[PDB]
Amino acid sequence: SSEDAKTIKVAASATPHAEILEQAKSILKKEGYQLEVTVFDDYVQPNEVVESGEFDANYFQHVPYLESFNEEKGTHLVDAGDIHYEPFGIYPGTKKSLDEISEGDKIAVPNDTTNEARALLLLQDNGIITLKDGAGLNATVNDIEENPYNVEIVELEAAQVARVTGETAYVVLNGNYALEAGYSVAKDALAYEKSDSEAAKTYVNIIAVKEGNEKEEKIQALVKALKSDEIKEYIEKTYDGAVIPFE
Numbered sequence: 001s002s003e004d005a006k007t008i009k010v011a012a013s014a015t016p017h018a019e020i021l022e023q024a025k026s027i028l029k030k031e032g033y034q035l036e037v038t039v040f041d042d043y044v045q046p047n048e049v050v051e052s053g054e055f056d057a058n059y060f061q062h063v064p065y066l067e068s069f070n071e072e073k074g075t076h077l078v079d080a081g082d083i084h085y086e087p088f089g090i091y092p093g094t095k096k097s098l099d100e101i102s103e104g105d106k107i108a109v110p111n112d113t114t115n116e117a118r119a120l121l122l123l124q125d126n127g128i129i130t131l132k133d134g135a136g137l138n139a140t141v142n143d144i145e146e147n148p149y150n151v152e153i154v155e156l157e158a159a160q161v162a163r164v165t166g167e168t169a170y171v172v173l174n175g176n177y178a179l180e181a182g183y184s185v186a187k188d189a190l191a192y193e194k195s196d197s198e199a200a201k202t203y204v205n206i207i208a209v210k211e212g213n214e215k216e217e218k219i220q221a222l223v224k225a226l227k228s229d230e231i232k233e234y235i236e237k238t239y240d241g242a243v244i245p246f247e
């Protein structure tokens with residue numbers, strides 16, 4: 001395990017996660033660690049490859065997603081560090097403005113528990129639907145009380161939502177997939193979560209590890225690098241408010 005002690009294998013999303021990790025590689029190298037990043041296109045395999053012990057950690061999900069994944073998939077993963085937040089947004093599909101919303105419009109949303117709930121909460125915040133009191137972080141389409149435009153919620157894998165912009169009136173995208181598809185939340189989103197919102201302190205992206213590894217020296221070194229002034233400044237200067245360092 002001496003070679004293992006110096007290497008940090010991290011499963012991550014393409015953007016911003018792998019780009020942020022690439023900047024942190026020089027920080028960790030100076031500290032005697034070899035950061036090795038593998039990029040994943042989905043939200044399932046990064047947790048499975050940490051649970052199996054193939055990777056030391058992953059950098060792709062928020063706290064509600066991890067909790068729901070531990071319950072729904074039987075993983076035992078832990079949040080080793082809170083790093084950044086990505087404003088969730090409603091982006092144009094076949095309609096370019098929310099003022100154009102009309103009866104029966106399809107809205108594409110992520111189909112996992114917490115990101116679907118997040119999409120329904122963002123639609124509620126924009127007066128499109130209302131949800132039952134107490135629906136919360138695991139709100140489903142069955143929690144919809146009011147639906148004045150009789151919108152059709154089209155549930156797809158989060159990675160696929162940006163690819164149905166010619167099939168649905170609007171699409172609700174995770175920051176990482178909006179960036180991957182070339183969107184800018186600040187310029188292109190029709191509506192998005194505010195940086196002083198409840199979502200801003202709830203959907204924080206983390207470093208997740210197997211239970212019992214959250215205090216490993218190398219994990220603590222990785223988390224400290226990602227929360228450093230060099231990484232926070234890189235995030236602020238690069239992503240134009242689409243990625244916000246956690247504080």
Ligand code: MET
Pocket residue numbers: 043060061062065085086088115174175176203205
């Ligand atoms: C896999 S949970 C979603 C993570 C995504 N980067 C977000 O902050 O919306």
Ligand SMILES: [Cl-]
Pocket residue numbers: 096097098099190191
């Ligand atoms: Cl609009």
Ligand SMILES: [Cl-]
Pocket residue numbers: 094104105106107167168169
């Ligand atoms: Cl439609």
Ligand SMILES: [Cl-]
Pocket residue numbers: 141151152153154
């Ligand atoms: Cl529906």
Ligand SMILES: [Cl-]
Pocket residue numbers: 041042043044157158159160
């Ligand atoms: Cl996905």
